[PDB]
C-alpha cells in the first residue's frame, strides 16, 4: 500500500526520459568503458586485474594526471602492435583509448581500445542528451510544448 506509485508518477515523461538517457544509457555506457579500461584491456595484455588488486592497479602508467591537465592524447600513445598475441604481453601496448579502425589481426575482431573509446564517447552524448527535458528546475523542454508547435506553416501536415 505505502509503496504503490501514483498515476502521476507513471506519467512523468520528462523525468523518465532524463534518467533513462543520462543514467540508464549514458552512465551504463560510461561504467562499461570503465570495465574495459580497468579489466578487459589489461587482461588482454596478460595482466590480472580483479577485485583483489584493482584499487592499486592503474589502467595507464600516467594515471589521471593527463586527464585533469587536458593532455588526453597521452591515452592513445602506444597501441597494441599488429603482432599482439591476445591474453599475452607479446606485442602489447599501453594505450587505453584509440581510433585505429578495423580488426586485430590475430583475433579478427574490433580493437578493445576502440571499443572502450566508443563507449566513453557515446556516454558523454547520452548524458548531455538527458538534460533536455524540464523536471524540477524550470530549464529544459516540455514534450507537450514541442509537439503542439510542430505544424508546417504551409499547411500540408
Amino acid at each position: 500500500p505505502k509503496f504503490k506509485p501514483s498515476l502521476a508518477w507513471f506519467k512523468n515523461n520528462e523525468s523518465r526520459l532524463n534518467h533513462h538517457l543520462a543514467g540508464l544509457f549514458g552512465v551504463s555506457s560510461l561504467a562499461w568503458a570503465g570495465h574495459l579500461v580497468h579489466v578487459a584491456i589489461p587482461e588482454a595484455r596478460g595482466q590480472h586485474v580483479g577485485w583483489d588488486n584493482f584499487l592499486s592497479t592503474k589502467p595507464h602508467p600516467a594515471g589521471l594526471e593527463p586527464f585533469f591537465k587536458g593532455q588526453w592524447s597521452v591515452y592513445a600513445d602506444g597501441p597494441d602492435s599488429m603482432n599482439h598475441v591476445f591474453n599475452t604481453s607479446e606485442g602489447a601496448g599501453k594505450a587505453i583509448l584509440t581510433f585505429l579502425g578495423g580488426f586485430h589481426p590475430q583475433t579478427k575482431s574490433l580493437w578493445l581500445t576502440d571499443i572502450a573509446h566508443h563507449h566513453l564517447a557515446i556516454a558523454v552524448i547520452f548524458i548531455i542528451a538527458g538534460h533536455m527535458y524540464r523536471t524540477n528546475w524550470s530549464i529544459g523542454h516540455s514534450l507537450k510544448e514541442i509537439l503542439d508547435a510542430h505544424r508546417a506553416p504551409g499547411g500540408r501536415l
Binding site: 587536458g70 592524447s73 592513445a76 581510433f99 514541442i146 508547435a149
Partner: protein, 84 residues
C-alpha cells in the same frame, strides 16, 4: 502555455528564454556563429588532416556554433515577422 499556432508565423513564445530578444540580435548573431563555426570546422579538419595530437578544444566547441546558427536564424525570422 499552449504552443499551438495557425497561419504562416509562430508567436515568439515558442522561443522560450529567447522570446523577448530582438530580431536584429538573432540575425547578426546567426551570421557570426555560422562564419566562426565554419572556420573552426575548416581549421580543425580541412586545413590539413586531423591527428591525435592536433585536436584543439576551441575548434571542437566552435563547431557547435554551426547547428546553433541554424536555430538563431529561425528565431530571427520568427521575431522579424512578429514585428520584434
Amino acid at each position: 502555455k499552449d504552443t499551438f499556432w495557425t497561419g504562416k508565423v509562430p508567436p515568439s513564445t515558442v522561443l522560450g528564454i529567447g522570446e523577448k530578444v530582438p530580431s536584429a540580435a538573432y540575425i547578426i548573431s546567426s551570421v557570426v556563429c555560422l562564419l566562426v563555426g565554419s572556420y573552426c570546422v575548416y581549421e580543425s579538419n580541412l586545413l590539413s588532416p586531423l591527428t591525435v595530437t592536433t585536436i584543439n578544444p576551441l575548434y571542437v566547441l566552435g563547431s557547435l556554433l554551426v547547428p546553433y546558427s541554424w536555430g538563431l536564424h529561425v528565431a530571427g525570422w520568427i521575431q522579424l515577422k512578429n514585428g520584434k
